[PDB]
Ligand binder design. Structure first.
Ligand SMILES: O=C(c1ccc(O)cc1O)N1Cc2ccccc2C1
Length: 218
């Protein structure tokens, strides 16, 4: 009897600054936790900008999907909140390297301000907003599909490492799917009215459709 499928699973250490940052986020109390959703949507919007732009000179880039949008899917039953976009997606290298974005040089000073007791809200200004996910999530999975590349799954419960592997789950056309497995004490971010108010307050100037799908298995 032979395997249905095989693959390598690789485990990586986070770069030092990012590991320190994740530790600060997880072990320090902050009031303004809701900004995590702002930061993920902003990431999605940047990814959509990137594919929109490239498609200008290469329309075939959109064969994997023409619609550019952001979907929010709370699933109380699984205690997950998923953010899905149809942006440019990430290569394996992009996932490894801070999820497709360059951590800014001021990140060091940012963390020092944090250890001095600064707020977390500016985190997205330094190219590391993604990690605000861990203000509300105990585990995060990222599924991503970039043109002319395989679908990958990234995952970390923090602790200083993440894994990357080709994803053999359900296929995405193109883009990035962020699945937050929420902490017991942060399930409010599964509530559709709470999500609506957060989008309203922090994501007014996102120039793509943002659509809430409240999921309930029957
Ligand atoms: O795939 C992602 C991504 C990462 C994290 C996320 O939360 C949502 C996302 O779509 N990105 C590709 C790309 C290209 C240029 C600039 C930014 C980005 C962000």
């Amino acid at each position: 009897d032979q395997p249905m499928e095989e693959e390598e699973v690789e485990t990586f250490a986070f770069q030092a600054e990012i590991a320190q940052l994740m530790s600060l986020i997880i072990n320090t109390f902050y009031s303004n936790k809701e900004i995590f959703l702002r930061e993920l949507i902003s990431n999605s919007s940047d990814a959509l900008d990137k594919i929109r732009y490239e498609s200008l000179t290469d329309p075939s880039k959109l064969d994997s999907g023409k619609e550019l949008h952001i979907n929010l899917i709370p699933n109380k039953q699984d205690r997950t909140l998923t953010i899905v976009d149809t942006g440019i997606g990430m290569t394996k290298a992009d996932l490894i390297n801070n999820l497709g974005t360059i951590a800014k040089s001021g990140t060091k000073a940012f963390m020092e301000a944090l250890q001095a007791g600064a707020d977390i809200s500016m985190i997205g200004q330094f190219g590391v907003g993604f990690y605000s996910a861990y203000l509300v999530a105990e585990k995060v999975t990222v599924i991503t599909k970039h043109n002319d590349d395989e679908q990958y799954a990234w995952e970390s419960s923090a602790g200083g490492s993440f894994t990357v592997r080709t994803d053999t789950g359900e296929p995405m056309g193109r883009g990035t799917k962020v699945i937050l497995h929420l902490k017991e004490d942060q399930t409010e971010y599964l509530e559709e009215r709470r999500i609506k108010e957060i989008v309203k307050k922090h994501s007014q100037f996102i120039g793509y459709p943002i659509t809430l799908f409240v999921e309930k298995e029957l």
